[PDB]
Amino acid sequence: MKLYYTPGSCSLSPHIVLRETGLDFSIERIDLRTKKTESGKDFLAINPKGQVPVLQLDNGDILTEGVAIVQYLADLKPDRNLIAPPKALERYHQIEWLNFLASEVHKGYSPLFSSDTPESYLPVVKNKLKSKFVYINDVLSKQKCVCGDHFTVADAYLFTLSQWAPHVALDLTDLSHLQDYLARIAQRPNVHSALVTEGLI
Amino acid sequence: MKLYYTPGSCSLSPHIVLRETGLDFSIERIDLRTKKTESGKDFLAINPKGQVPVLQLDNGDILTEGVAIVQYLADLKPDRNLIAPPKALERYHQIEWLNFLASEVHKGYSPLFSSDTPESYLPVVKNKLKSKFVYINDVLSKQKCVCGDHFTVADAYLFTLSQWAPHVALDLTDLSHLQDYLARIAQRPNVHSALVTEGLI
Numbered sequence: 001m002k003l004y005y006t007p008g009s010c011s012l013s014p015h016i017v018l019r020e021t022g023l024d025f026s027i028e029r030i031d032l033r034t035k036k037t038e039s040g041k042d043f044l045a046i047n048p049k050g051q052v053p054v055l056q057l058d059n060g061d062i063l064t065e066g067v068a069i070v071q072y073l074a075d076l077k078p079d080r081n082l083i084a085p086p087k088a089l090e091r092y093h094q095i096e097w098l099n100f101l102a103s104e105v106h107k108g109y110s111p112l113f114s115s116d117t118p119e120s121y122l123p124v125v126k127n128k129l130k131s132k133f134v135y136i137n138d139v140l141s142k143q144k145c146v147c148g149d150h151f152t153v154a155d156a157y158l159f160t161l162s163q164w165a166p167h168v169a170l171d172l173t174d175l176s177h178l179q180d181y182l183a184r185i186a187q188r189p190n191v192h193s194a195l196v197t198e199g200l201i
Numbered sequence: 202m203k204l205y206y207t208p209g210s211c212s213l214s215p216h217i218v219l220r221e222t223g224l225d226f227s228i229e230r231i232d233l234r235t236k237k238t239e240s241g242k243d244f245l246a247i248n249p250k251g252q253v254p255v256l257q258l259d260n261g262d263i264l265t266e267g268v269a270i271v272q273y274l275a276d277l278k279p280d281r282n283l284i285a286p287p288k289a290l291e292r293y294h295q296i297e298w299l300n301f302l303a304s305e306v307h308k309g310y311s312p313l314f315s316s317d318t319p320e321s322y323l324p325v326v327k328n329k330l331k332s333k334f335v336y337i338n339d340v341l342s343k344q345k346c347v348c349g350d351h352f353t354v355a356d357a358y359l360f361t362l363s364q365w366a367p368h369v370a371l372d373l374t375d376l377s378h379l380q381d382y383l384a385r386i387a388q389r390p391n392v393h394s395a396l397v398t399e400g401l402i
């Protein structure tokens with residue numbers, strides 16, 4: 001099981017999940033500029049969409065899209081409780097949150113990382129994004145995690161998306177519930193070890 | 202089971218799926234401008250995020266996010282084959298496509314429907330979007346549907362997202378594989394009947 005990643009990218013989410021499940025895996029750094037693996041192979045041949053994360057299964061199959069990857073992983077180790085059982089109501093609310101984070105938050109960052117974005121539009125984009133974290137902050141005021149009382153794959157995803165905030169000058173320091181939650185998630189051995197292995201920390 | 206929708210919106214996807222599964226449901230039109238149901242109730246009390254689709258379950262629970270809604274629906278009628286069984290490999294590739302459509306295509310339209318978007322940025326956004334459909338078109342050249350040989354919930358979603366193309370002057374007429382696929386999907390009784398019931402056709 002190999003994970004194609006780029007340090008500090010959205011591939012940190014499946015990286016955290018891989019450690020939290022205790023599965024046997026290997027990672028391979030991808031260079032998003034040249035689209036080449038650290039071993040010199042063409043990454044477009046692996047994933048035509050040219051992005052990370054990408055999970056290579058032991059049988060050879062390739063899986064793209066982070067939300068699909070973390071569900072496949074968590075489903076392999078039911079006993080970890082990183083996702084609810086299939087067909088359970090709690091599972092659909094998790095899927096619901098994974099989609100909210102992928103389309104509203106994750107994709108909300110995109111224009112802030114693009115060079116072709118009008119400097120006059122940046123303020124507008126940043127505000128749309130903060131309104132998203134404000135919603136998340138309100139939710140974290142009556143519960144310990146985004147989907148409930150325990151740590152799930154959606155939490156791994158949110159910690160990852162929160163990390164970028166400083167790099168694009170998005171202020172989230174007024175969101176104390178979110179700030180306390182981030183601090184907690186960061187002291188988890190499996191999360192901390194993921195950051196170390198990637199060169200952050 | 203009630204579906205909160207707006208004619209021709211992204212809520213057409215779960216609408217098509219509800220008919221394809223043959224479940225007992227009702228629909229209620231939402232006014233996105235005033236955020237009020239057609240029965241005069243405050244929609245923000247139902248869905249704080251203020252968007253459609255929204256599915257009200259018989260037990261009272263509320264489900265948001267289209268990708269979560271269509272999975273919950275299809276999972277209720279395994280025999281229809283609108284999604285693969287949970288934990289099956291085919292299921293994760295479907296989840297993978299549902300995420301691609303939600304974050305890369307669906308969210309890719311967003312700036313084209315916003316009034317606060319610089320007219321100079323529109324060309325850039327449109328091109329990013331077409332590159333997405335070009336990828337989808339290539340895929341449809343060696344298979345009948347987006348995820349395989351049969352009709353799944355991801356197909357209901359793509360037909361829905363393709364419908365908007367003309368309204369934002371996005372040309373997809375050079376994508377013959379996509380054009381033939383759309384024509385096929387449209388002649389399905391359950392899809393056709395969804396369009397009629399919504400005022401399109």
Ligand SMILES: *SC[C@H](NC(=O)CC[C@H](N)C(=O)O)C(=O)NCC(=O)O
Nearest residue numbers: 009010032050051052053065066304
């Ligand atoms: S975070 C790094 C970028 N990945 C994605 O945007 C993944 C999007 C998928 N829809 C998903 O996994 O959810 C990335 O690798 N971008 C490539 C680049 O060239 O910047």
Ligand SMILES: *SC[C@H](NC(=O)CC[C@H](N)C(=O)O)C(=O)NCC(=O)O
Nearest residue numbers: 103210211233251252253254266267
């Ligand atoms: S398509 C109509 C709009 N819905 C969404 O954007 C849903 C986004 C979710 N992430 C999802 O369901 O996938 C909508 O209702 N917009 C509200 C408005 O005021 O325009």
